[PDB]
Design a protein around this ligand. Structure first.
Ligand SMILES: Cc1cc(Nc2cc(N3CCN(C)CC3)nc(Sc3ccc(NC(=O)C4CC4)cc3)n2)[nH]n1
Lengths: 43, 253
């Protein structure tokens, strides 16, 4: 599989450092982890 | 709130199959880099671990610590369960131990301080055990430890939800890790299982010249047959050796 520029080599590395120094609000970006609904999943 | 596979971009696979179906991804809207792990319901149904997972997710749900790999959220389709997880840029510890062969005092002591705080945190949040085998340990950007943990009528719920490990099992595993980091192999390794078991139960611990006195003391205090005699977490992070050699970095967490 060809590997996107962003995911390879250097541009990955920069994306990581920025992200490391800019910890965003995780409640916003992802939300509230809901209880796993075992039945509405395996049936 | 809601999520689908359609709002991530895959970068590359990570496991090489070793850790299942795991992928470097970023969320399309934010360009935030996560690690995405795909779980097949057929593999779960099979092994009958649906209640572990349910419960595991509830555990991770409220586990915010810079030395615990973070679960951001999850989602599912007709056949798969996807976990949106924190991406640890330096990957697996056990590979970095190979590149290194062994770890110096500072690296190893730092890792003992990070473990001790991660696990103490966990107790304070009613999570009494976590799996620490070197397979489960990842490295942050600045080298920081990241513990990554997934895997009849008379059975109580704790057995069904997988939550059966004792608090003092980890203290032992801490000893084993410390030794393996400094020596480059575990303390009771052998040609055979029979021999290894005999060595483990007899705690036949032998320190080579490459283990500094201070480590011998810590390790000897953790690796005790009797679990009540094992050195508490609070005393592991307060150990003189650990405290003198630990140069621990923290992220803006
Ligand atoms: C889940 C996860 C994985 C990562 N990061 C990485 C990073 C990585 N790298 C490959 C080697 N170079 C040096 C770049 C870093 N290699 C792996 S290989 C790997 C894959 C999976 C796991 N562990 C799991 O998937 C556990 C959570 C279920 C450990 C190592 N995982 N962050 N988060």
């Amino acid at each position: 599989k060809p590997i996107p520029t962003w995911a390879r080599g250097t541009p990955l590395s920069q994306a990581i450092i920025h992200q490391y120094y800019h910890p965003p609000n995780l409640l916003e970006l992802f939300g509230t982890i809901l209880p796993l609904d075992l039945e509405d999943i395996f049936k | 709130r809601h999520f689908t596979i359609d709002d991530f971009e895959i970068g590359r696979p990570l496991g090489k199959g070793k850790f299942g179906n795991v992928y470097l991804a970023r969320e399309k809207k934010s360009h935030f880099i996560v690690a995405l792990k795909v779980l097949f319901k057929s593999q779960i149904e099979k092994e009958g671990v649906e209640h572990q997972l349910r419960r595991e997710i509830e555990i991770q749900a409220h586990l915010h610590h810079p030395n615990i790999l973070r679960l951001y959220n999850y989602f599912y389709d007709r056949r798969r369960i996807y976990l949106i997880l924190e991406y640890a840029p330096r990957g697996e510890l056990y590979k970095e131990l190979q590149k290194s062969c062994t770890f110096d005092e500072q690296r190893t002591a730092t890792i003992m301080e990070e473990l001790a705080d991660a696990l103490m945190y966990c107790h304070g949040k009613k999570v009494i055990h976590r799996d620490i085998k070197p397979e489960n340990l990842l490295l942050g950007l600045k080298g920081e430890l990241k513990i990554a943990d997934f895997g009849l009528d008379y059975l109580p719920p704790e057995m069904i939800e997988g939550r059966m490990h004792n608090e003092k099992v980890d203290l032992w595993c801490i000893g084993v890790l410390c030794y393996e980091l400094l020596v480059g192999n575990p303390p009771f390794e052998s040609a055979s299982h029979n021999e290894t078991y005999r060595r483990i139960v007899k705690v036949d611990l032998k320190f080579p010249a490459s283990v500094p006195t201070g480590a011998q003391d810590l390790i000897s205090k953790l690796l005790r047959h009797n679990p009540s005699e094992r050195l508490p977490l609070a005393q592991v992070s307060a150990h003189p050796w650990v405290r003198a050699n630990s140069r621990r970095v923290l992220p803006p967490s």
